[PDB]
Amino acid sequence: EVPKEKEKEKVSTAVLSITAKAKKKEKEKEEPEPNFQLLDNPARVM
Amino acid sequence: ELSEEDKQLQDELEMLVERLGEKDTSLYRPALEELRRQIRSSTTSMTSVPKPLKFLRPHYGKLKEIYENMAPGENKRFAADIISVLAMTMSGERECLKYRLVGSQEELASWGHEYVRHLAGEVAKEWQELDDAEKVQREPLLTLVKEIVPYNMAHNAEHEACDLLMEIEQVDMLEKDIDENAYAKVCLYLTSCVNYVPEPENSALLRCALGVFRKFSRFPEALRLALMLNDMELVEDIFTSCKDVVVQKQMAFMLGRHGVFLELSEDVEEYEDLTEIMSNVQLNSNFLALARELDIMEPKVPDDIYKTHLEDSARMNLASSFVNGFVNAAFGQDKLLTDDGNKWLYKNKDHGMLSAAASLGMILLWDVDGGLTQIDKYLYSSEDYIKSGALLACGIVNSGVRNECDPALALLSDYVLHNSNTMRLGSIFGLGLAYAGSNREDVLTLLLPVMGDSKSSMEVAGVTALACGMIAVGSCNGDVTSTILQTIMEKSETELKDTYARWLPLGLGLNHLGKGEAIEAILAALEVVSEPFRSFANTLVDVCAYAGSGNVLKVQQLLHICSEHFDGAHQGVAVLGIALIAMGEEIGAEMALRTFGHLLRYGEPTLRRAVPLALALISVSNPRLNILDTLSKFSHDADPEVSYNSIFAMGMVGSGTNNARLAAMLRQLAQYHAKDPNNLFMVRLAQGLTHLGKGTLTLCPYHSDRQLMSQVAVAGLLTVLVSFLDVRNIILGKSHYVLYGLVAAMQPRMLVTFDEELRPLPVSVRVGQAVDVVGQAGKPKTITGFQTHTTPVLLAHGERAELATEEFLPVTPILEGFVILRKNPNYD
Amino acid sequence: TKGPDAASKLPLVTPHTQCRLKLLKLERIKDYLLMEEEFIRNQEQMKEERSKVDDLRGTPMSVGTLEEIIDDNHAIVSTSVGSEHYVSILSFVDKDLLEPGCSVLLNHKVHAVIGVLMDDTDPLVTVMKVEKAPQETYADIGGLDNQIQEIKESVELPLTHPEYYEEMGIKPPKGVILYGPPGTGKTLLAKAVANQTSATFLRVVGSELIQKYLGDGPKLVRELFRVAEEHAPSIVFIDEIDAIGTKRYDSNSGGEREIQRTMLELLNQLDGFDSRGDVKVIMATNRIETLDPALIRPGRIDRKIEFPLPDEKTKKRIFQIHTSRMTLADDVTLDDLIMAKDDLSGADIKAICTEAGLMALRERRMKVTNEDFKKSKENVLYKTPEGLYL
Numbered sequence A: 001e002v003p004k005e006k007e008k009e010k011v012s013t014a015v016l017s018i019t020a021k022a023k024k025k026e027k028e029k030e031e032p033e034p035n036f037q038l039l040d041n042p043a044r045v046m
Numbered sequence B: 001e002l003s004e005e006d007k008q009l010q011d012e013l014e015m016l017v018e019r020l021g022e023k024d025t026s027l028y029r030p031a032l033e034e035l036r037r038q039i040r041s042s043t044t045s046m047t048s049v050p051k052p053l054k055f056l057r058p059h060y061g062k063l064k065e066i067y068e069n070m071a072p073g074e075n076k077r078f079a080a081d082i083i084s085v086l087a088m089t090m091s092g093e094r095e096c097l098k099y100r101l102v103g104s105q106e107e108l109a110s111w112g113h114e115y116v117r118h119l120a121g122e123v124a125k126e127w128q129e130l131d132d133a134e135k136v137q138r139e140p141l142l143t144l145v146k147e148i149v150p151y152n153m154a155h156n157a158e159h160e161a162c163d164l165l166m167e168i169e170q171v172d173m174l175e176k177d178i179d180e181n182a183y184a185k186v187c188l189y190l191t192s193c194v195n196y197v198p199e200p201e202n203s204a205l206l207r208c209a210l211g212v213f214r215k216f217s218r219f220p221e222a223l224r225l226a227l228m229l230n231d232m233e234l235v236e237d238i239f240t241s242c243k244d245v246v247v248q249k250q251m252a253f254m255l256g257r258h259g260v261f262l263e264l265s266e267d268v269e270e271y272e273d274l275t276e277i278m279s280n281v282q283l284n285s286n287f288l289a290l291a292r293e294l295d296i297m298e299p300k301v302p303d304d305i306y307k308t309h310l311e312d313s314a315r316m317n318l319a320s321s322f323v324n325g326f327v328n329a330a331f332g333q334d335k336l337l338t339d340d341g342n343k344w345l346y347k348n349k350d351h352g353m354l355s356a357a358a359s360l361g362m363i364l365l366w367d368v369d370g371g372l373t374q375i376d377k378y379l380y381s382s383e384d385y386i387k388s389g390a391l392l393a394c395g396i397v398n399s400g401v402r403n404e405c406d407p408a409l410a411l412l413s414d415y416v417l418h419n420s421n422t423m424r425l426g427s428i429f430g431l432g433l434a435y436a437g438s439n440r441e442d443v444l445t446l447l448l449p450v451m452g453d454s455k456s457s458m459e460v461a462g463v464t465a466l467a468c469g470m471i472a473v474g475s476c477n478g479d480v481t482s483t484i485l486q487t488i489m490e491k492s493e494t495e496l497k498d499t500y501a502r503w504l505p506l507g508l509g510l511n512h513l514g515k516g517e518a519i520e521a522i523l524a525a526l527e528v529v530s531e532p533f534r535s536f537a538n539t540l541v542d543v544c545a546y547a548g549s550g551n552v553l554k555v556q557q558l559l560h561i562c563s564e565h566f567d568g569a570h571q572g573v574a575v576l577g578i579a580l581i582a583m584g585e586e587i588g589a590e591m592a593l594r595t596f597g598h599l600l601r602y603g604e605p606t607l608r609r610a611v612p613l614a615l616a617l618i619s620v621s622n623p624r625l626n627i628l629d630t631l632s633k634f635s636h637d638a639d640p641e642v643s644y645n646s647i648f649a650m651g652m653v654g655s656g657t658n659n660a661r662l663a664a665m666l667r668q669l670a671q672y673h674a675k676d677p678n679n680l681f682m683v684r685l686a687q688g689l690t691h692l693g694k695g696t697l698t699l700c701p702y703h704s705d706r707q708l709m710s711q712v713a714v715a716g717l718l719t720v721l722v723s724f725l726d727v728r729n730i731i732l733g734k735s736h737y738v739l740y741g742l743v744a745a746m747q748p749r750m751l752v753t754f755d756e757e758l759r760p761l762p763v764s765v766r767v768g769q770a771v772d773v774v775g776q777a778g779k780p781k782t783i784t785g786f787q788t789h790t791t792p793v794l795l796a797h798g799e800r801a802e803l804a805t806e807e808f809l810p811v812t813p814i815l816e817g818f819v820i821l822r823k824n825p826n827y828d
Numbered sequence C: 001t002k003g004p005d006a007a008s009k010l011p012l013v014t015p016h017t018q019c020r021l022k023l024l025k026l027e028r029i030k031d032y033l034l035m036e037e038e039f040i041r042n043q044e045q046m047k048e049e050r051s052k053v054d055d056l057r058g059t060p061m062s063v064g065t066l067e068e069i070i071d072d073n074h075a076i077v078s079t080s081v082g083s084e085h086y087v088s089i090l091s092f093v094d095k096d097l098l099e100p101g102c103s104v105l106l107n108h109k110v111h112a113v114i115g116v117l118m119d120d121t122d123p124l125v126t127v128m129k130v131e132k133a134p135q136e137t138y139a140d141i142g143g144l145d146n147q148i149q150e151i152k153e154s155v156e157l158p159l160t161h162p163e164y165y166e167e168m169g170i171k172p173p174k175g176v177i178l179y180g181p182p183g184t185g186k187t188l189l190a191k192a193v194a195n196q197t198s199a200t201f202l203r204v205v206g207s208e209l210i211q212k213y214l215g216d217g218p219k220l221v222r223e224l225f226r227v228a229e230e231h232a233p234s235i236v237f238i239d240e241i242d243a244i245g246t247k248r249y250d251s252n253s254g255g256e257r258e259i260q261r262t263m264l265e266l267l268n269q270l271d272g273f274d275s276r277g278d279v280k281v282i283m284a285t286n287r288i289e290t291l292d293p294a295l296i297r298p299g300r301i302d303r304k305i306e307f308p309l310p311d312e313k314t315k316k317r318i319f320q321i322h323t324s325r326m327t328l329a330d331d332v333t334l335d336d337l338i339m340a341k342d343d344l345s346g347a348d349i350k351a352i353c354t355e356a357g358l359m360a361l362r363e364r365r366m367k368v369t370n371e372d373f374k375k376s377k378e379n380v381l382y383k384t385p386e387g388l389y390l
């Protein structure tokens, strides 16, 4: 597929003295894996 | 490399510890006694290198093992105390109190004061690293805190106790240990810390300091702190919980200078005197007395300011009207309008007339009766613009003065809902700036109904939003919020793109100024607007909420908004918001200046236009070369809007200062932009601002000690600056009348004294810079650079006045504005 | 009129004591700095004709001295190796801005005028600018109230309140000389001016304007005052000016004549034929008597400020200032050291405080004491017959 478009990213929003306290305040306020293969008559067999 | 006695002590300690190691279990008690005696003898001494502590460093682990392996009993804790005092030096897993709790629990002073300091810091650290559970583990730490706070009180370490209590997050126990010899040095420290901490700790510290002040009957300081908290019940309690009448008079002066007005019943000793003081009915008389006492009552025409003699179609004449109003503000007398009259209110070419008449109001500022007379002469005109300007003039005249009668209400209510968006557009604004701090329901009941009706443009709706916000600044008035939100929800993407719609979010923010967190609801009930008018409204209401809060997280969010590339006006609002959240603490302001410079360089035009407004807001009537140079080097910018804003910001930063090296910049800039009328108008307006009230008024929204943020002043400043956020259309055109919003901010810059009878007492004072020598975490600030005058006197920015002689005691410990002075009984 | 250069300086944390309020103030400074850093990072993370114009411009552009511009598209330039060429001027150049002697830019190979480089300030004079701002505020100067007042009236009031002088048609002093014994605040009062001034401060030492070759010292002085006048308001602080400026005797050597020539160039800059902008000069001197009258003239040096050894109250101020940050004990009464009528500069008092602290540390005690101060006073001060009078 297409590699998709990567937008512009802000770099690791700076942590200030009280940023962790604000985050704490916000925290308080809140397979089968088949073993089989079937090939039609035109069979691309490696 | 030691000494013989030192080696002998080392050997003694080694022998004692080894005996502890030996499993005799019979002579443990003598050895522990001896170790404890040596350790406390060394620790309590003045030696900063306690020798027993030094020599037991190797054996720390062995002492741990001995503590663990000895059977429970008295010796257990009797050695745990030794282990703790040792751990005072070696740490990393923070043991000292971890072994003090299982200890002998003796007086927490026998082990010197260094032990106390270490254990206090460790109690704080344990407190932070405890979850809301483990409460049973938390009481024994409060016992150590009750042993530490008194000890710090007795040993001059009041700042240590304050730090311990504000870091334990319980600033409530100081009241038990404070003494009349401590309240000053504790309240000052708490107040200093307030500006820099966030909520809810900001309010916790403010209420703690208020309680300390109320304990010792320091009512004026308690009222200043109660005003910092925008809480009217507390100020009512303080103002009515007092028995001395003179101090109540002084507190009434303080309330009047601030925007508040207390409705007092018929119970206080002197209700009428107090309401007169708190209503500012004596502001005009005092101002005129000050003007007479300085020889300034001599109206100066605009030409005296332009000073074009040394070194007129339609707009420079509007500039003449505006500068005339600004210069001769609150003086009553004038020479252009007052006197000849009918000449600079005509030939102003239609729309400018609406503001020229308003100029009259700003000349008769705080003068209700003279206002009435001169304005009524002009209140009956064949053309609508004159009547609108006269109504606005009545509003200006009644601004800041709480007359018992309601002239503004009557006159301007007759013309609200008028069948013309020009009498509406002056009467609404007049009511808004006349009853700004009032919060009266009877004026909002008349204003709110006019935002919604087929016969109202975006101009009328926005000016009603401004008015309602100014009436109810920082009150979370449900009716105002509901009506503004309805008006925002009832208009399409177009019809919401007028730049007169900025004023509905501005009304919201003004109505929520300083409330802060409680704003989520309005930014949660506002996430349904169109995209281009939702970042603007969201950002504006957010910045208004945190006005003067100094919340670095919110400033970070605003800077994130600025970083985004949108080829977008909410970025301009975010720059002004960075200014708005940081006009409080001084340390924040200079750093914001650095940030604004970076924004000017690494910035798109949209926020480039907004940086000058931020510079104006952060420094209002505070001319500093750092900002004036910045604005001057940007007064020549290619972008017209950045220029315009830079010129007006030079006007604002120097407003009411008469600065000579700003007047020179403005004249040279007037020649430079002679051929551009759109810059000539703005330079003329900056000149008028620089000479505002001929050097007698300040637009700063911060009065008492630079610490009380007047809500009304911020309201006016925000109206004007947000209007500048679109200069080319809002103000360089139709709605140049919005400049008169500054009326809400202009407030004398004088010190005037009285006796205990409301009669002047000229007394000698020293006026000088707000400097100190050593803060020492609590020491007051003392003026440096004295200059002795006799009151009345004008205080410039950064100037404080201290009574040059001991003859009088001020009621308030702040000599700014009106101060009642008791005649000292002691002497002098 | 490039504008003031100023000197960026962070706020000052009022509480010098180690307490939570200081931590909050410093943390606020730091968090603002972090927001600024992230804002710059995000600007550069979210971010033709001029590029091709620069490509056409020479890659290793040379710098040459324009001389006798001709026509509107042809000028004679110099190669800085003595050779000169009749070069052409591309349209990229500004024109109406080239002046003879201006250090224009030339294409490396074809040698065509392509730039003007109007920033050809010599490194010797670019280094002597002040970009930092020493953290010596006026609150670190005990006493010297009159001297502080004089210098404020000379270099601060004319910038902060330029209405008093125009209101009486008076030109404020443009020159101050701070003279006194060895160590009294002469350099502190320039450090404080630099700290508290919004003007371009220019440190210089008289022993630095002297140059090896002939005619280079005067050229350096002319360049220094040219930059000081381009940036305005500006203050030029010539420390220890008696390096150049000593009496002008009749020389017999050549180096002495060149030094006197440098001094005359300085004199012409201070008060010469043409004019002087808003450049204010502060010289510093230990021995003023040896300076030339033409330099001490009260047209070049309007104010002369003596810094005598401090009296008793000033000495008490010095001890207070320099023991403020010291954990002084309650056994110390800083009056015994004051009273002794011996020559004590502020430098001597600071050395006394430092040596007292070192004596305490030697005794293993972090809190100084009176015996420590006595020992320090005895051991720091290094340097009429009896009965001849009285």
Ligand SMILES: Nc1ncnc2c1ncn2[C@@H]1O[C@H](COP(=O)(O)OP(=O)(O)OP(=O)(O)O)[C@@H](O)[C@H]1O
Residues within 6 Å of the ligand: C140, C141, C142, C143, C144, C180, C181, C182, C183, C184, C185, C186, C187, C188, C189, C285, C286, C307, C318, C321, C345, C346, C347, C348, C350
């Ligand atoms: N009045 C004063 N107040 C405070 N400190 C002072 C004072 N006078 C001198 N000092 C101290 O002197 C030391 C430096 O003195 P300074 O540089 O001002 O001397 P100076 O007059 O320039 O000397 P010199 O002629 O040797 O260059 C610093 O410790 C400064 O604190």
Ligand SMILES: [Mg+2]
Residues within 6 Å of the ligand: C186, C187, C239, C240, C284
């Ligand atoms: Mg020196």
